[PDB]
Amino acid sequence: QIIHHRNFQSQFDTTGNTLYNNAWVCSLNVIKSRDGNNYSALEDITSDNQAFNNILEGIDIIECENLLKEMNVQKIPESSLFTNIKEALQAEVFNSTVEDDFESFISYELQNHGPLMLIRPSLGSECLHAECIVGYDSEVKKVLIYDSMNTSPEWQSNIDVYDKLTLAFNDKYKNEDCSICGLYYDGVYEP
Amino acid sequence: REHLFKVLVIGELGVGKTSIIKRYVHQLFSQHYRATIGVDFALKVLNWDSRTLVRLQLWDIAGQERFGNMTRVYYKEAVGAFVVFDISRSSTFEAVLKWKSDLDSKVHLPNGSPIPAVLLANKCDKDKEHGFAGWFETSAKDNINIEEAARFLVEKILVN
Ligand SMILES: Nc1nc2c(ncn2[C@@H]2O[C@H](COP(=O)(O)OP(=O)(O)O)[C@@H](O)[C@H]2O)c(=O)[nH]1
Ligand SMILES: [Mg+2]
């Protein structure tokens, strides 16, 4: 139903032979851009920023926490529909009632707050990763994900997206420097 | 000409999985790899031969190493695997079978056969058939056999 229109950016180079740690700028560009354009984050990435186009490491976690406040990137408010999902994420269970609450949670947040940015522990790396929830489809039960590791937006199943959310909200995987993990959104978006 | 292979790096905590990836991909070694916001997995591009280019995805099991259970979003589409243990610790070698069994329950080749899995005897600076296609005495600190083990895995992946 709810599908937002944003430009996709890969953190790989054009040939796909170079992998940059640009997940932070890519995801920030997704939630801040509009109507298939690109947000102007060039003042932050070009000005002698060692965390941009870096093949070894990305942006510092505490430095990224302050960057989100400057760009009006807010954490989603702790609502009751969010709390029920978060308690289900602590149990790592995805039954029908949880899946229905997940469907209504993602639908509500995408409608009222626009595309969401997920900061979570990486799946195949020691660091953190950032990806974006940009659409949802209740017919096929899939979520539209803007993951800069891929070459294009991807429709992923709900339980796969649910397992990604588990990394950011379950206490098993949260380290001492995972205080930035969670779901964010553009503070200037309005439906 | 271009191939994309996803390979899992699994094992117990403190055996050298992150160090092996950092040594092979970034030619780097240290005892504390700080965390940033950048990537979901590692990438290594290989000029395998004159007519083949191999892009090797290295997925560090990372936060799932203390619990030993594999999620689909992690292991999906995997075609190879490194199983790493520490030779200086006896308990870390014991859990190699527990990782190999959990690996054999989740991922498999398209024909149903098990995926090529290489056993890494890390910290080698300081056989039994359970399904492993090979074994290597590797050292992330001294850069020993890490590059050979990668080509040995890519070769077994290209056989299929
Ligand atoms: N001497 C030596 N030390 C190693 C080697 N590989 C890893 N280490 C050390 O083992 C410690 C933990 O390894 P780590 O990278 O965290 O392995 P992981 O927990 O499986 O990701 C690090 O402080 C490294 O210095 C090796 O080949 N030789
Ligand atoms: Mg590690």
Numbering used by the authors:
A (entry chain A): 23 to 213
B (entry chain B): 22 to 147, 162 to 195
Quote what the paper states about this structure:
The protein GtgE has been identified as a cysteine protease that targets members of the Rab-family. Rab32 is involved in controlling the biogenesis of lysosome-related organelles (LRO). It is believed that GtgE inactivates Rab32 proteolytically and thereby prevents the delivery of antimicrobial factors that would impair Salmonella infection. Furthermore, by using a combination of biochemical characterization, molecular dynamics simulation, and binding studies, we demonstrate that GtgE shows exclusive selectivity for the inactive GDP-bound state of Rab32.
Crystals obtained after reductively alkylating the truncated Rab3218-201:GDP:GtgE21-214,C45A-complex and the full-length complex Rab321-225:GDP:GtgE1-228,C45A diffracted up to 2.3 Å and 2.9 Å resolution, respectively. The average B-factor of the full-length complex is higher than for the truncated complex, though the entire electron density is well defined for both structures. Due to the higher resolution, the truncated Rab3218-201:GDP:GtgE21-214,C45A-complex is discussed only and referred to as Rab32:GDP:GtgEC45A hereafter. In the complex structure, GtgE can be envisioned as a trident poking into Rab32 with three spike-like protrusions. Spike 2 is represented by the β2G–β3G loop (where subscript G denotes GtgE), and penetrates deeply into the switch I–switch II cleft of Rab32. Thereby, spike 1 and 2 form intimate interactions with the switch I structure that is also the site of proteolytic cleavage. The shallow cleft between spike 2 and 3 is filled by the switch II region of Rab32. In particular, the N-terminus (amino acids 23–45), including the position of the active sitecysteine (here the C45A substitution) is now resolved, in addition to the loop regions β2G-β3G (i.e., spike 2) and α4G-β6G (i.e., spike 3). The complex interface buries an average solvent exposed surface area of 1535 Å2, as determined with the ‘Protein interfaces, surfaces and assemblies’ web service (PISA). The switch I residue I58R forms the center of a hydrophobic cluster and interacts with W46G, L81G, C86G, I141G, L150G, and I202G, whereas D61R from the protease recognition sequence forms a specific interaction with the guanidinium group of R142G. The interacting polar network between the catalytic triad, C45G, H151G, and D169G, is formed in the Rab32:GDP:GtgEC45A-complex once C45G is modeled to the active site cysteine nucleophile.
